[PDB]
Amino acid sequence: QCVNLTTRTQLPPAYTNSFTRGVYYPDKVFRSSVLHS
């Protein structure tokens, strides 16, 4: 079933500054005490 929630209009997109968030682990290899690029 569906409900047509309707936004009379899309509000203008709001831009916020990401604060250096979001770095994931590349591969499942144990690394400790290193600066690996």
Nearer to another protein, 8 or 36 (CB): 36
Q: Which of 4, 16, 20, 27 binds another protein (CB under 8 A)?
A: 27
Q: Does the footprint of another protein cover residue 29 (CB under 8 A)?
A: yes
C-alpha 1/C-alpha 36 separation (Å) is 50
Q: Does the footprint of another protein cover residue 28 (CB under 8 A)?
A: yes
* The three-state (H, E, C) secondary structure of the chain, written as one string: CCCCCCCCCCCCCCCCCCCCCCCCCCCCCCCCCCCCC
Q: Which residues bind another protein (CB under 8 A)?
A: 27-29, 36
